[PDB]
Amino acid sequence: NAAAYWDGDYYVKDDGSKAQSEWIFDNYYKAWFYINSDGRYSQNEWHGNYYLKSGGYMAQNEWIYDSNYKSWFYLKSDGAYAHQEWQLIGNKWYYFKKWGYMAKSQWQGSYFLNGQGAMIQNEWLYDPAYSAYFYLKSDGTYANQEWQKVGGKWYYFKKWGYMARNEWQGNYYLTGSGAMATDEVIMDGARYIFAASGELKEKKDLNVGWVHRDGKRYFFNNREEQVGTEHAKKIIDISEHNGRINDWKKVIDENEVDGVIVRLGYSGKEDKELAHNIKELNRLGIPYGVYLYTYAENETDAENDAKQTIELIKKYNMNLSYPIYYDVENWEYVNKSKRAPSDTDTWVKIINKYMDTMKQAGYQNVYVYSYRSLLQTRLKHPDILKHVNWVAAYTNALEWENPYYSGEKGWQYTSSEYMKGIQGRVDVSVWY
């Protein structure tokens, strides 16, 4: 007489009565609908373990995004949401937490789910929480207590998946990058010779670095050769990243430090320890210079860097025995929105601007600091290189010449020295 039909939002059942608070299957649509207590079909909402989409159709074998929970959900073959379980969907593995929330950007035991919720396979993962590298294998599990060949190089993963670095594993040494050593490594006052396949061949004891010879002191690089003379100076650079230094006199005497380069901060921001560092060095009469890490992008930025530098110098009553350093590197913001110009000409302009501003303000003991590879590429210009007298190269020898600068200079040869009176690694240079 009038059965099994939709009357707007209402549904008339097999008999001839209105549906109410019940599931009905429509044969035309081949779909389930849940009819609410109001008599109307539910839509854009959950009912128990099931989701009713726009138009009322129960979701089955499909993803649903719920704006209320800001979460993806997956609805199984019977409509029930996936929860506390793994599902293979479109040839990828997904994990669903309690209440059906898709896991994303997190671990689930030995597996890691990316931002789209997919289990990672054959990929590197840095995890800040564990502050280390992991490698998720073909099966999705993190590599552990085993070797892995990745991108043509060999890596060792320890218990809990940690990538070994700067450490031994049997006859093999994992370098700073984590990759197996295949040639030579100088460390612990020794030279180590590895076969091309990685196993240690030979160990030779060396006496290198700062060596004390009968009342005198010299610096020897890793190729057992002298840098500078007996008057070579040990210069550290310090920043908030070294934490707070409570006993500066201890630091200076016990490590035989001749001077310090102190971080001012970076473009627009003052180093947290600058005030304390300047105060202490001033009071103790330790020779120091300073450096600003630049995030410049143009001449406006370069002028702002100099202005900031000048303000800080007068503010803290800085007494500068060593230069003011423009720390020039391949910078990038943490959110990666901006990164340094690549072209030589833009940096000629930036560096020239900074120098010119400093000069007109009365500061002429101003120089550029950078690392070797950059001075060889995007910085290789007579107008820049004329300002360079402090070069980083964490190598066995500097092996870099600068025709455009003559006189006293520094080589930052390490970022991993330990020193009495300081916690953690310290940057150290030889001045010569």
Ligand X SMILES: C[N+](C)(C)CCO
Contact residues toward ligand X (CB under 6 A) are 6, 8, 23, 32, 41, 46, 48, 50, 55-56, 58, 63, 69, 72-73, 78-79, 81, 86, 93, 99-100, 102, 107, 109-111, 116-117, 119, 124, 130, 133-134, 140, 142, 160-161, 177-178
| Min CB(121)–ligand X separation in Å | 10
Q: Which is nearer to ligand X, 134 or 293 (CB)?
A: 134
Contact assessment for residue 167 and residue 178, using Cβ atoms and an 8 Å cutoff: no
Q: Which is nearer to ligand X, 163 or 236 (CB)?
A: 163
| Min CB(151)–ligand X separation in Å | 8
| Min CB(201)–ligand X separation in Å | 24
Contact assessment for residue 354 and residue 371, using Cβ atoms and an 8 Å cutoff: no
Q: How far is CA 120 from CA 23, 100, 151, in A?
A: 39, 20, 17
| Min CB(289)–ligand X separation in Å | 31
Q: Which is nearer to ligand X, 74 or 295 (CB)?
A: 74
Q: Which is nearer to ligand X, 72 or 431 (CB)?
A: 72
Q: Which is nearer to ligand X, 160 or 338 (CB)?
A: 160
| Min CB(123)–ligand X separation in Å | 10
Residue type for 184, please? E
Q: Which is nearer to ligand X, 7 or 256 (CB)?
A: 7
Contact assessment for residue 410 and residue 431, using Cβ atoms and an 8 Å cutoff: yes
Burial state string for 112-145 with b = 16 or more CB within 10 A and e = fewer than 16: bbbeebbbbbeeebeeeeeebbbbbbeebebbbe
Q: What are phi and psi of 344, to 5 degrees?
A: -60, -45
| Min CB(136)–ligand X separation in Å | 9
Q: Which is nearer to ligand X, 154 or 322 (CB)?
A: 154
Q: How far is CA 71 from CA 25, 58, 65, 379, in A?
A: 28, 18, 6, 48
Contact assessment for residue 174 and residue 167, using Cβ atoms and an 8 Å cutoff: yes
Contact assessment for residue 421 and residue 251, using Cβ atoms and an 8 Å cutoff: yes
Helix intervals (H) in 138-286 = 248-254, 274-284
| Min CB(84)–ligand X separation in Å | 11
